[PDB]
Amino acid sequence: ARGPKKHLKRLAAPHHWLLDKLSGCYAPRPSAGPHKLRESLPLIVFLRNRLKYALNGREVKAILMQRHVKVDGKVRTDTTYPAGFMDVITLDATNENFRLVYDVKGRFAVHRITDEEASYKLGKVKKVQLGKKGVPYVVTHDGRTIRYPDPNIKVNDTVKIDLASGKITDFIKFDAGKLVYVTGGRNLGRIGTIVHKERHDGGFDLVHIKDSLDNTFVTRLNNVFVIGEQGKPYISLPKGKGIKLSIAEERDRRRAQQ
Amino acid sequence: GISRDSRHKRSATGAKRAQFRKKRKFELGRQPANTKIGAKRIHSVRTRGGNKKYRALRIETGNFSWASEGISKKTRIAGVVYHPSNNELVRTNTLTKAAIVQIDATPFRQWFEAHYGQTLGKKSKNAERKWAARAASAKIESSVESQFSAGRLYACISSRPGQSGRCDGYILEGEELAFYLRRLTAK
Amino acid sequence: PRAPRTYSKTYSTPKRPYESSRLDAELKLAGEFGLKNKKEIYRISFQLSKIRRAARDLLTRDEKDPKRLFEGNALIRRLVRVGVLSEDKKKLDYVLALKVEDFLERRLQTQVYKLGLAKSVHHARVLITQRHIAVGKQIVNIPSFMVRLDSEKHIDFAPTSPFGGARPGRVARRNAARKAEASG
RNA sequence: AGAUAAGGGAAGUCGGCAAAAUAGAUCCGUAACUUCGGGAUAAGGAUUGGCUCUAAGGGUCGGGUACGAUCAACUUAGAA
RNA sequence: AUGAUUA
RNA sequence: CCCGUCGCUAGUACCGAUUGAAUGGCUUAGUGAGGCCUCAGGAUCUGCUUAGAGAAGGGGGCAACUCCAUCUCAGAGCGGAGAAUUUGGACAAACUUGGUCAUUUAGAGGAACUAAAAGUCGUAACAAGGUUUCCGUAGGUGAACCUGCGGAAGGAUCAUU
RNA sequence: CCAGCAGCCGCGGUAAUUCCAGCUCCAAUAGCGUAUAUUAAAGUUGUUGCAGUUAAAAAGCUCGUAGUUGAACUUUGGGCCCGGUUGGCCGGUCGGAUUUCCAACGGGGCCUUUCCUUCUGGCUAACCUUGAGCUUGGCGAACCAGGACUUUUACUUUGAAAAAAUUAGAGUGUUCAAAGCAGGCGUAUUGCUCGAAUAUAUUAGCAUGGAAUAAUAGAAUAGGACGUUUGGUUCUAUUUU
RNA sequence: UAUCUGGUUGAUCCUGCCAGUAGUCAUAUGCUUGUCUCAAAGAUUAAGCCAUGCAUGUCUAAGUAUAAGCAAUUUAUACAGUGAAACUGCGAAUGGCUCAUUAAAUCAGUUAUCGUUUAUUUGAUAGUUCCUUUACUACAUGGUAUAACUGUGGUAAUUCUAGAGCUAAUACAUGCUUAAAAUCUCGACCCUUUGGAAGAGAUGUAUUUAUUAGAUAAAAAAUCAAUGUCUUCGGACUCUUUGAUGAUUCAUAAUAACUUUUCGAAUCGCAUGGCCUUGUGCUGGCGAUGGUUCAUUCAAAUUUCUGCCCUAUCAACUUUCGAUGGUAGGAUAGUGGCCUACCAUGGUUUCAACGGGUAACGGGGAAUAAGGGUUCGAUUCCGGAGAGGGAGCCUGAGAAACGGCUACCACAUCCAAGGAAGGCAGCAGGCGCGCAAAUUACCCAAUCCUAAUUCAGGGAGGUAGUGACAAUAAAUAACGAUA
Numbered sequence A: 001a002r003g004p005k006k007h008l009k010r011l012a013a014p015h016h017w018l019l020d021k022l023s024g025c026y027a028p029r030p031s032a033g034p035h036k037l038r039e040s041l042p043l044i045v046f047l048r049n050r051l052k053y054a055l056n057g058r059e060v061k062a063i064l065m066q067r068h069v070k071v072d073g074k075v076r077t078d079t080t081y082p083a084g085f086m087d088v089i090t091l092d093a094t095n096e097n098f099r100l101v102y103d104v105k106g107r108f109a110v111h112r113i114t115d116e117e118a119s120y121k122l123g124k125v126k127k128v129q130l131g132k133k134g135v136p137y138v139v140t141h142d143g144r145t146i147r148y149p150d151p152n153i154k155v156n157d158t159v160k161i162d163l164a165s166g167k168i169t170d171f172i173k174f175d176a177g178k179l180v181y182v183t184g185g186r187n188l189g190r191i192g193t194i195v196h197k198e199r200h201d202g203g204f205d206l207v208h209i210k211d212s213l214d215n216t217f218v219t220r221l222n223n224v225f226v227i228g229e230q231g232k233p234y235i236s237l238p239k240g241k242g243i244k245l246s247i248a249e250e251r252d253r254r255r256a257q258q
Numbered sequence B: 001g002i003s004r005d006s007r008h009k010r011s012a013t014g015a016k017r018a019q020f021r022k023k024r025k026f027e028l029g030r031q032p033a034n035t036k037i038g039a040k041r042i043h044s045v046r047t048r049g050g051n052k053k054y055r056a057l058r059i060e061t062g063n064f065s066w067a068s069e070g071i072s073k074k075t076r077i078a079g080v081v082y083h084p085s086n087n088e089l090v091r092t093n094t095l096t097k098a099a100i101v102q103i104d105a106t107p108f109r110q111w112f113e114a115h116y117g118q119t120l121g122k123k124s125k126n127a128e129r130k131w132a133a134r135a136a137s138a139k140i141e142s143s144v145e146s147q148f149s150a151g152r153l154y155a156c157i158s159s160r161p162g163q164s165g166r167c168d169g170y171i172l173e174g175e176e177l178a179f180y181l182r183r184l185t186a187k
Numbered sequence C: 001p002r003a004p005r006t007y008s009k010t011y012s013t014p015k016r017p018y019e020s021s022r023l024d025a026e027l028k029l030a031g032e033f034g035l036k037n038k039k040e041i042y043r044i045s046f047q048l049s050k051i052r053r054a055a056r057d058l059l060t061r062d063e064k065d066p067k068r069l070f071e072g073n074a075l076i077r078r079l080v081r082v083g084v085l086s087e088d089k090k091k092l093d094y095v096l097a098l099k100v101e102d103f104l105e106r107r108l109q110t111q112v113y114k115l116g117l118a119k120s121v122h123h124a125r126v127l128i129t130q131r132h133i134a135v136g137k138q139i140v141n142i143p144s145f146m147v148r149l150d151s152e153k154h155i156d157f158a159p160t161s162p163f164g165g166a167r168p169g170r171v172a173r174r175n176a177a178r179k180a181e182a183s184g
Numbered sequence D: 001a002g003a004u005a006a007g008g009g010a011a012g013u014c015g016g017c018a019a020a021a022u023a024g025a026u027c028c029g030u031a032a033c034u035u036c037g038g039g040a041u042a043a044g045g046a047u048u049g050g051c052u053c054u055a056a057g058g059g060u061c062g063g064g065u066a067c068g069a070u071c072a073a074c075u076u077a078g079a080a
Numbered sequence E: 001a002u003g004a005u006u007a
Numbered sequence F: 001c002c003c004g005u006c007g008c009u010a011g012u013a014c015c016g017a018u019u020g021a022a023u024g025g026c027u028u029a030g031u032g033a034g035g036c037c038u039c040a041g042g043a044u045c046u047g048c049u050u051a052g053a054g055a056a057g058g059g060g061g062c063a064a065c066u067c068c069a070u071c072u073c074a075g076a077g078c079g080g081a082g083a084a085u086u087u088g089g090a091c092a093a094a095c096u097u098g099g100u101c102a103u104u105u106a107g108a109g110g111a112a113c114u115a116a117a118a119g120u121c122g123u124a125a126c127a128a129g130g131u132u133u134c135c136g137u138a139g140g141u142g143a144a145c146c147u148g149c150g151g152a153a154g155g156a157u158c159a160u161u
Numbered sequence G: 001c002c003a004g005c006a007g008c009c010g011c012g013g014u015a016a017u018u019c020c021a022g023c024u025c026c027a028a029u030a031g032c033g034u035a036u037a038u039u040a041a042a043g044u045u046g047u048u049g050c051a052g053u054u055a056a057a058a059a060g061c062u063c064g065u066a067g068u069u070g071a072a073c074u075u076u077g078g079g080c081c082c083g084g085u086u087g088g089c090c091g092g093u094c095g096g097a098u099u100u101c102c103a104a105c106g107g108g109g110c111c112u113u114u115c116c117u118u119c120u121g122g123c124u125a126a127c128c129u130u131g132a133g134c135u136u137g138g139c140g141a142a143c144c145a146g147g148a149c150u151u152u153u154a155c156u157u158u159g160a161a162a163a164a165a166u167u168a169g170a171g172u173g174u175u176c177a178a179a180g181c182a183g184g185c186g187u188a189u190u191g192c193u194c195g196a197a198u199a200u201a202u203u204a205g206c207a208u209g210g211a212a213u214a215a216u217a218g219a220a221u222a223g224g225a226c227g228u229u230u231g232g233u234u235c236u237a238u239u240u241u
Numbered sequence H: 001u002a003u004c005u006g007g008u009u010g011a012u013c014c015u016g017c018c019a020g021u022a023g024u025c026a027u028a029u030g031c032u033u034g035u036c037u038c039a040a041a042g043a044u045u046a047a048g049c050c051a052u053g054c055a056u057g058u059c060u061a062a063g064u065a066u067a068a069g070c071a072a073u074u075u076a077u078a079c080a081g082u083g084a085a086a087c088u089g090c091g092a093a094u095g096g097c098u099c100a101u102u103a104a105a106u107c108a109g110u111u112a113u114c115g116u117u118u119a120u121u122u123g124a125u126a127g128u129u130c131c132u133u134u135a136c137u138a139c140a141u142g143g144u145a146u147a148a149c150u151g152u153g154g155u156a157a158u159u160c161u162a163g164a165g166c167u168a169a170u171a172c173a174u175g176c177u178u179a180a181a182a183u184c185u186c187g188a189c190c191c192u193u194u195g196g197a198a199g200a201g202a203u204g205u206a207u208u209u210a211u212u213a214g215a216u217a218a219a220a221a222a223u224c225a226a227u228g229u230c231u232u233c234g235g236a237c238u239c240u241u242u243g244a245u246g247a248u249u250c251a252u253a254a255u256a257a258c259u260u261u262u263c264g265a266a267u268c269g270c271a272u273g274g275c276c277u278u279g280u281g282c283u284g285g286c287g288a289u290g291g292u293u294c295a296u297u298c299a300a301a302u303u304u305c306u307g308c309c310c311u312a313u314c315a316a317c318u319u320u321c322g323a324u325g326g327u328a329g330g331a332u333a334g335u336g337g338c339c340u341a342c343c344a345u346g347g348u349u350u351c352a353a354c355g356g357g358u359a360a361c362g363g364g365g366a367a368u369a370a371g372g373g374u375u376c377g378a379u380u381c382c383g384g385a386g387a388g389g390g391a392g393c394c395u396g397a398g399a400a401a402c403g404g405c406u407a408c409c410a411c412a413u414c415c416a417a418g419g420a421a422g423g424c425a426g427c428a429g430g431c432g433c434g435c436a437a438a439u440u441a442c443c444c445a446a447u448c449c450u451a452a453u454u455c456a457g458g459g460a461g462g463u464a465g466u467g468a469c470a471a472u473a474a475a476u477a478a479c480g481a482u483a
Helices: A043-051 A057-066 A115-117 A247-256 B087-094 B108-114 B125-134 B143-151 B174-185 C021-035 C036-057 C064-082 C091-095 C101-106 C108-115 C120-127 C171-183
Strands: A040-042 A069-071 A082-084 A088-091 A095-099 A111-113 A123-130 A134-141 A144-147 A158-161 A168-172 A179-182 A195-198 A206-211 A214-220 A224-228 B041-047 B050-057 B061-066 B071-076 B079-082 B099-101 B155-159 B169-171
Touching: A040 A043, A040 A195, A043 A069, A043 B174, A069 A134, A088 A115, A088 A206, A095 A115, A158 A224, B071 B108, B079 B087, B079 B174, B108 B125, B108 B143, B143 B155, B143 B174, B155 C108, C021 C101, C036 C064, C036 C091, C036 C101, C064 C091, C101 C108
Parallel strands: B061 B169
Antiparallel strands: A040 A082, A069 A088, A088 A095, A095 A111, A123 A134, A123 A158, A134 A144, A158 A168, A179 A224, A195 A206, A206 A214, B041 B050, B061 B071, B079 B099, B099 B155, B155 B169
C-alpha cells in the first residue's frame, strides 16, 4: 500500500500476546528489531499485560524513558521494541531478571531469574557465511552477528554468549540425541530430545522429537531450538517444562485445588 | 512512461486483459542511451533505492583485457564493425554490449616490447634475463599478429555502458576471432 | 474499526403458530409458574434444545473418545452443579430426557415460593423485582436465575428492607409521619 | 476554343445541363442484398521525390574406391 | 341447428 | 358443455418506409497539448591569469632614474553554475471524422395474443356428437372446418380352425 | 352483488356467523402488521433424493468421437512367541488398586521355496566371543555420513499447516442474560496464585504407515536379470616414485 | 427441533401449482412506545455536485538563534536559562472513505527470489585519502552564500512575489592528520654466471571488465624440462591448504586496469578527570547525529500449484501494428516480448478457449436447515482499486500520490475583465436521487502512530447527541378480612 505500513489494528496483532478485543481499536505494532513481528513480545505489552507494573501506555513509556528497564544489558528506550524469544531483561529495582521463554499453552511466559543467569543466554545460529576480508562469521536468532567462531560451529547449532560482548563463551553441535525446545507452530513450548530426522534434499528437513513421557511428534528443523543434552537444560525452564498433558487431567487438576 | 509489466499485454490464450490498474513506478522503463564516441558525457540517474546509474553517452576511451595474458589497458575505440543484434548500431556507430570494435593497439604493442623485447610489424642484464625467461610464449597466432601489424585490434564489448558508464571488453582470440572474421567477410 | 461486539439471540418462535394443544399447555405452564411471556418459555426450550444437541452429537460417538468424555463430563458437572439433573443420573440419557418444567422449577421465583417467603409465585415475582430478597450477600432482581443449591443454603431477605431488619419501610414511615401530624 | 476566380455552395434551372472534384501503384479496410457466382476499385483512409546503404531472390565449372571460383538481370522489402 | 347472466 | 371468424373497449409484445433518433463502450485515420529524455542555446551571475595608463605614498643613485600597492578603464583568454528558447524521440490526454458493438426509444400501417354478466354468424368437438376422432403433408373455403394420400387407437371390434 | 372484505376458497342481489361500529373472546407482547428479496417448507432441482405407458417428459432408427462405465485371475494358508487395551477369582485398600488366571481386541517379530537395496566406514550389534558364572575376538544401520537401483498415481490413516474476530466448546455469578476474559485466596500491615483451553476448517501443496479397490509399464522378429568369471573399447582417478 | 395445511370433483385417489406457515446482522414503511445493558447508520438509485469550518506537522542535555522576544547570569565576556519565526533533518506513501473498474484478473491457501530494491530499527564493519605522494597544502582545522530579519516595495484578489543590506549549519562545495611487516614490478651496481642486489612505485573500500583459486571415492612402481626442502645430492620427503549448498560462474581471496571518483567524522550535549618532560603539553569518560559494506527486521515487487457467477440466440481465438519460442541487445531494482533487431511458426480450444452480461471487488464470514445443501457477503479484519475521467512527472528508501504539481475534457468559484484558485468515495454539514439512511458538538483522558522527540500534533481514535436497524434483561401489580 504505496509504502511501508506503520499502524496495526487489533485482530491483526497475533493471538499469543493475549491482547483484549476491547480497549481501543489499535494494537501495538512491533517496530523492527532483532526478532520478527509475530514471534516477539513488545515491551509495552510485557510491562502492561504480563506483570501489571504499569496501567497505561504513557506510564510504560515513562518507565522505558526514565531507564529503569534494560534488555540484553542495554536500556533500549523504545516503547515497541521486540523482546523476542530466549532474551534477558534486567530491572535494578527489585533486582529481577526476566527471561522470555515459551509455555506449553502457547504463550510468552515470564521466567524469573538472577543476574548471573542473565549474564549468559543461548542463541541458535540462523546461518553461517564468509564476511569481507576473509572473516568467517555467523548470525543467530536474535540479530546478533558474530565473527571468527570455531569451525566446528555449523548451521542449526547453538551458542552461549557473554552479553558484554558479542563473542562466544561456548557452543553446542547438532546431532541425534540432544535436548531441544520448539519455537513456532502448534508445538509452541514443547521440549523434546531428538530421536532422528529426515532430509528430503530440495527443501524442508523434518525432525522427530519426543518429550520424556515417550510422547513423540515431528516438527520443522527451522522451528526447533536445541538447548543442550538429555537431562540437563542449559538454562532454567518455566513451570511445566513443555509436556502438554491432556485437557481432562488439567480440569481435574484445577478441581483438586478448589 | 514506458511500462515493463504484463497487465498491458495479452494473455497466453489470446485475451486482451482489461485495464485494471494505473501504471506504476515499480514497473517503469526508460529511453535507450544510444551511446557514441568522443567528448565523454556521463549523465547519472536516480534509481529505485538511490543507487545511481551512470548513463553513458559520447564515450571516447575504454578498458580492454587480453585474456591469454590477463592484462587490461586503457585504449581508444576506432568504431564498431559488427553487432549481432542490429547492423544499425554498426552503421550509426552506437556502443553497446557484444559489440565488435577496433582499438588503437599501441599500449599492447609497447607493453609487449617492454615485457618480452620482441619486435612487431616491419641491453641491461635484468631486462635480458626477464625476456629470456618469458620466451616460448610470444607465438600467439596469425590473426592477432596481423592485427598488430595493422595497428587496429578487434575487441568485444562486454560491459553495459548505458548501465555502467564504461565501455569495457576484451580482445578476440582464436575461435571466435575466426568466426567473426568469417561473418565480416561474407559478401 | 471498532471490533464488533458478538450478539446472539436466546429464543425461537413456534414453527406452527396456532395449535390449541401447545397453546393451552404452555399457558398452563405460564399461569402456574407465574410468567408473562411465551418468550421465557421458548427461551427455556431453546436452552433445552442446545443441551440436547450436545448430548445427541456426543452420544453418536463411541465411548472413551476423549472429546465425548471431556464435553459430557463438563456438561454433567455443570448440570448437576445447577441441580436440574440429579446426583445419581449421570449416564447422559437423562440429559436427553430433561424437561422444561425442571428448568422452570430451578428458577428463583418458584424457589422463593418453595422456601415459603411468598404464599404465591406472583408475590415471589414482585418480591424479586422490588428487591426484598437476596440469594447470597448481594441483592438480585431477576427471576431467571437457575440457582446452584449452594444458593439454597445462602438465601436470606434483603438487608435493606424488613423481614431481615435494618429499616422499617418507605410507606411505613410515610403513614407514621401522616398519623403523627394527624394526632397533633 | 481554352483558363482562373475571394465568401457562400445548386440558392440557378424543366432538370447539377456544363464545369469542377475523384483518378496510377502499394498497404489497410469493406455494408445491405444475393441466383452464393457477385456487389467491389463498394464506401472509406494512409504512403509515394532525391541520395547513401542494408536484406533476400540466380547460372555455369570444381571434388576419395560441408565449401570455393566465375558471370549477369531487375524484382521486392526495410533504414538513415 | 340453438338454448343469455348469476346462484 | 364447447369452437372459430366478424363487431365494440382496454392492455402487452412483434413486423414496418423513415439511409429513424438519442446514450454508452471499443476503435482505424488525421490534428495533437503537456510533462519526461536527447541535440543545441545562452541571457545572467561568479573564480583565475596576465594587462597598460590618468598620478598620490614611501624606500634607494638623492640629479635625470628605479619597486609595489592604489579610484580608473579597456583587451585577451582559463573556467563553474546557468533560466527563456530549441531539434529529435518515447509516454500519450483531448478534438474531428468514419466504422462497429450493445441499451432504450418515435412511427403511417400490417398482423397476433389476452382480458370483457348478458354482440352477430353458424355448430367443429365431447354419445357411433349425428360424415369415428386424432397425426403428418398438400390444396380449398366467411368461420369453425372440408377433401385427397399414407399412419395410429387415445375406437364404436381384444373374438370366426 | 352497493360500500367494501378476502394472500387462497370465497362473502355482499332486505333474515351478512366474513363487510362498517359496540360488546365479548383469542394470538404475540413494548412490540404487532404490511411491501419486496431470500431460506426451511421443496423428494416443486432430486449427489444423498424426483418424474418420463396414459398426468409435462423415450430423440423415427442405427452408426460414432470426446465423455462416463468396463469380465475373472497373480500371497492364501498355517504354526511359534512377544508385549499393550478391556474386564475377570483372591479385594490381599476401608467407591480407589494387585498378582497366575480362564476371554476378546487390534499391534511387534520369526519360520513355513516368501530379498521385504547393499558398498565404504567407524557402534561391531544381538559379540561363536567365558575369565570361576559380571570375561579378550561372531555377520554395520539397531547410531549415523555419504553412492546406489530409488516404475507411477488415485485412495485412505497420522502429522506439519490453515492470521484474528466469527462458529462449537472448558472455566468464570456481567447481580441473571446478551457480553467480556476476567478472577480467586491470605495472617487483608508484608502479599500469594490457576487462567485466557480444545475442536472444525472444502479443494490444492509437504512428510508419513498401509496395500484392499481402480487403472499403470516390465522379458517374446529376447537390444532379458543376476556373472566371483574371461576379454577388448572408453574416459575418470588417490597414494607414491 | 427429519412435522404440514386450504383450493380443480356430485364425491374419490393422483400429478401439479397457487395460497397459508416459520425465520433473515434483509431492507423500506405503518400503528404504538415506560426502563437497564450493548449498538448498526447516505452502500443499493447518482464513483452525482459541493458553500463553510477542520482533518499532519515536528526537538532534546544534545544541528543552526545577537528574535532590536521574555525572566535573571552573578557557575560563567561568546553564548552558555527559556524561547516564536526561519534554514536544516524527518514525516506528510501510515491512517481514514468509497466499491466505480476488474471474471485466471484481483483474491485464498501454498512455493520461490540460486531472479531483485529496502529508509528505519537491531548486530558487526573503513591504521593504507598529502598523488615528483621534500615545501606541492591551515589540520590546536579551510571557502561561499542564503533564509528568517532591516527597510524600499508591486497587484483588486492568491498559503501571490521582486529590488537592496547582513549573517548562520550535521545546508552546499573542499580537505590532511598513526605503526610495523609482505609480494610484485622495475632496476642502478657488482657483473656473477649457484648468481646476489642498493635505491624506487603500488597495495583500504566502492564501480566496471577479464583471468585464476574456491577441491578432495584408494594403494604402489619407471623415468625425465630442472636436483626443491637438507644432504652420505645414497635421496628420508612425510610436512603441505580452501567454507557453505539439494545444486551455482555462491560467499570469499588474489592478479591487470578502469572511475569524470564513492566511503574512510572539519557535527553536537554533559561531567570535567589524570601523567609529569609544571604546559592552553599529552592523554581520558557517558552519550546524540551521520556514514561504505554485510547480516537482520518492518516491508516491497515479481512468482510456482489449485480454486470463481450466468451464457454456445458466443465455436473457434491470438499474430496487422507481439501473438508462441530462440539468439543478441537495450531498458529494469531485478528475471522475462518488458521493449527493440533478425529468425522458426508457433501458443489456447467441447476437459467450454475466445466474445457478451453482471442490480460482480475477492476472501475470513452471514441467514437458513436432521444430513446433503441454497442464498447473500458494499459494509468493522486481510488483500486489491480509486480520488470527477484520463494521461504525465518531481521529491524521496517507499507514490504514477491527487487534503502534490503539469496538461486536456466536462463541472464550478472570485473578478476594480488583466488574471487567480479548486476537486468531501476524510469529519461534520448542504442540494439532487430516491422506498431507503444521524450533530456544521467535546477531547487527545484512554488504544496506537509520527517528529529532532517522555512534554507537541492527530475529526486515526474515544466521548456525548439523533437513533424501535438488530440483540439482552424487564414495570404496568401483589397480599388480608366482609356479601
